Amino acid sequence: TSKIALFDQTLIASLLQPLSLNQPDFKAYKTKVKLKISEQRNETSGEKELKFEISRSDDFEFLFSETLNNEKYQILARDHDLTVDFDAFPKVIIQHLLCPTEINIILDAEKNFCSFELFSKTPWSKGKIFSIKLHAVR
Amino acid sequence: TSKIALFDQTLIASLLQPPDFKAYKTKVKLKISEQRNETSGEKELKFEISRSDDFEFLFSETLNNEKYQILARDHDLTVDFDAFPKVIIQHLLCKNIPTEINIILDAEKNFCSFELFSKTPWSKGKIFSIKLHAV
């Protein structure tokens, strides 16, 4: 309705997850993941929201999302030293990184949440852009 | 004697100092060298900052592998101790005669933070910061 799709593509990501509840060591696989980025209006406040949704074509049980408003974004920008404002944020990652880039998806052992992480390698670092905690769509 | 110069250039830096900061663009000489610690024999990386006009402006820090590991941990560096100087010299300090250098002074000028940046479309792009001490 108010929802505007900004990005909807299948990406190659590394999916990481603990071996079990008691074994925190990760197992890692390269998997194809659908990433959807959209903007929408919060129904109670009318303010702009940025929604991130991750799914898989094979695994219907794999559904994670997070909606960011300007306040939530400021926390993210603060934690990852982002300079870009809330409105410019989606445009930059879409035009410069999502279109060398690495995506990591780290699952909870209970699969209640997953950390969506984006990287742009430098000659001296992994070049982490940001990580977003996405929650299971339940 | 054991000292080997890896870098010796005049760079443009922003000198910041305190309650709030005042900032000026200043020319600073940066010297990077490798040397042998006299007591241990281990390799050391030395960073020295000076100015031609201000003789009182003298700051240095010597990093060994252990000290470097702390720096790499604090700034998510992937490059090893031996490759570190080459990477910064060849990719970031080569273009300075989107690289920016900040030098942040102590109010008492006992120490200064030497910070290196490579701007990205989403961030300032801090590479690292080294606390240098007054010589």
Swiss-Prot record, chain B:
Span of domain PISA: 40-92
Localization of this protein: Cytoplasm; Cytoplasm, Cytoskeleton, Microtubule organizing center, Centrosome, Centriole
Disruption phenotype: RNAi-mediated knockdown results in failed centrosome duplication in embryos.
Domain of life: Eukaryota
Subunit structure: Nine homodimers form a cartwheel structure with an internal diameter of 23 nM and radial spokes connecting to the microtubule triplets. Interacts with sas-5.
Record's comment describing the protein's domains: The coiled coil domain is necessary and sufficient for interaction with sas-5. The 35 nM long coiled-coil domain mediates homodimerization while the globular N-terminus links the dimers at an angle of 40 degrees to form the inner ring.
Function text: Central scaffolding component of the centrioles ensuring their 9-fold symmetry. Required for centrosome biogenesis and duplication.
Protein name: Spindle assembly abnormal protein 6
Organism this protein belongs to: Caenorhabditis elegans
Species lineage: Eukaryota, Metazoa, Ecdysozoa, Nematoda, Chromadorea
